[PDB]
Write a protein that binds this ligand. Structure first.
Ligand code: NA
Ligand code: NA
Lengths: 358, 358
């Protein structure tokens, strides 16, 4: 029996920052409304491609683990906003980092993608030969947004987080996990007309609908994550009291609080950074984990609960038993190209196109 | 120790057929050129979305396995041509089939995606609780093609294949597998400007380049698949003589023959249907497997070699040990909506747009 220890962690948040007030300047919204409704105060807008964010997050996680690029056997990029479909962007990260030979694939399960990736990488390592893995959640959701639609325009942001996993006989890393999908709810959270369902040659094909039935999403999210968490707890033989830290998906602070409140888990155990970054889909969990660790919120041998949900409606929970080390073995000086533009400058063109089309 | 038996197989080929002569009518090519160069004589053009093809292939595989939709714990759709990115199309297949609860994700490793999916599903089942899985390779590559570019326009086609896997203690299904990616070659096979790297609001964004460096692809494919096959053979403790059947990716008949010739495997062991369908990327392997089985080419307890390669440059090989049953337990009458148009009629609009833009 073996396990996939999380030996490295890393993050990449692009610099350009879009505040709630910024949004209020071109949208019929308010900082009060956004902040009280969602807990979000800021989010980041990338001046680079998704794969670029993924790459920097990877470099930091690799440095953190002290592993050689030559030792990585598997690369998973959880994203729903890839630079390209042919080829995948896992291979771009691989090319960028000089990793030879490794299996490289993109995994799309929306905001639950990092948890799906962690589960997949862990089980691949447990049942076969993979010695080390890189699992990255990375998104440029700003690509998708309709800047005239306040319901969705204020929720999402860009970023990446990564882990490195290493095979071990110690009982650490992801233990039990339950991942799933409530497909009867597929239509409540969707951009159905970006992908091969779109009309390639229609000049209005950029003006797609972003379906977001907020209340039903909230209900189904709390239900799905909560039930998944119950299953993992029950199978683990841990009480709710023995969970040391919750690292939740960051969609809405009220969902986080409800999940905790209903699971009987103390609210202060939940790591929250949604106020800084908004909902970065697949990146939420690995960014939160990285920052939890950076901030000393996780101690060695802690039991962590992870939970997430997203379009699908995909959902998941997992139990991670931490090992001995919560500090990086080294640091990377990797960075994004400098950006000379505010978020508002970066979005300028898109905001004008969306507004012009109404 | 447990295993993931292939208990169900199924396929969906759309009806509209584009012959080599059809292509010659709007392209500076010939049936002689295509046929002698690639082995391709026909390919299918879908009148429906990728997810629709995936769904029919799934229904047949489910019927073949005699498993209940209630028993499926995992759904993987290997594709690089999804209807949509938000949400994934695995969840659409799930919704369509009424499968409750199952994990559902899209996996993108280009034409190696089905092998990546089979490996992933198998290891998930071996190391965790998943009882049954659906793994589907499905593509509408016709979405991507530039109908003025003869190098690529003649190679690719649409379709889907699926398997159902079931957990067992018998030593059957996927045994050893080696999957990988030669990222130094990422740029030789690419559509870099469909995805979030594209300019959403540029009215010429449909006219993307399809990079295809044919000779270097051929070289790197033969090398990668051949080395992967060597590793699986070596680790299995089987001689090349003990491989009963090869189910290869269908990119080019010369690649198939070279792979076999260089591996010392008799050419007549390789199942080939490229002449009918061309290169359907992730669907090639599962369609070939399904048809091999339909045609009685696989016997119980046979040792199968699978091999594939694609954009990335992803690559893989696997050894499948067949179990007892090579006939379906039942049949599905599922079908695509009727199509009243020839392939040429379906492509009409796209061909005119591409030609008009030169
Ligand atoms: Na504990
Ligand atoms: Na044999």
């Amino acid at each position: 029996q073996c396990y996939a220890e999380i030996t490295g962690w890393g993050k990449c948040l692009p610099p350009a920052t879009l505040s709630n007030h910024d949004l209020s300047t071109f949208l019929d919204t308010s900082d009060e409304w956004i902040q009280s409704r969602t807990g979000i105060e800021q989010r980041r807008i990338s001046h680079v491609n998704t794969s670029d964010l993924a790459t920097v997050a990877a470099q930091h996680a690799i440095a953190c683990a002290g592993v050689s690029v030559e030792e990585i056997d598997l690369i998973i990029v959880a994203t729903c906003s890839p630079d390209s479909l042919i080829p995948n962007i896992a291979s771009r990260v691989q090319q960028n980092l000089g990793i030879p030979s490794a299996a490289a694939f993109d995994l799309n399960a929306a905001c639950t993608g990092f948890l799906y990736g962690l589960e997949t990488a862990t089980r691949l390592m447990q049942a076969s030969h993979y010695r080390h893995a890189l699992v990255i959640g990375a998104e440029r959701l700003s690509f998708y947004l309709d800047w005239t639609k306040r319901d969705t325009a204020v929720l999402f942001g860009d970023g990446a987080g990564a882990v490195v996993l290493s095979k071990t006989e110690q009982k650490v890393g992801l233990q039990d996990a339950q991942i799933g999908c409530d497909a009867q709810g597929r239509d409540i959270l969707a951009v159905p007309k970006f992908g091969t369902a779109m009309d390639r040659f229609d000049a209005d094909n950029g003006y797609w609908a972003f379906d977001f039935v907020g209340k039903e999403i909230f209900k189904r999210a709390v239900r799905g994550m909560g039930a998944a968490a119950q299953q993992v707890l029950a199978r683990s033989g841990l009480s709710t009291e023995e969970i040391d830290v919750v690292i939740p998906h960051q969609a809405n602070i009220r969902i986080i609080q409800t999940l905790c409140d209903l699971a009987g888990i103390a609210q202060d155990k939940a790591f929250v950074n949604i106020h800084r970054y908004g909902n970065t889909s697949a990146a939420t969990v690995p960014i939160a984990l990285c920052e939890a660790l950076e901030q000393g919120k996780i101690k060695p041998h802690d039991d962590l609960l992870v939970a997430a949900f997203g379009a699908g409606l995909t959902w998941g929970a997992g139990h991670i038993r931490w090992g001995e080390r919560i500090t990086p073995l080294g640091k990377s000086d990797a960075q994004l190209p400098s950006c000379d533009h505010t978020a508002l400058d970066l979005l300028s063109k898109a905001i004008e196109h969306c507004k012009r089309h109404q």
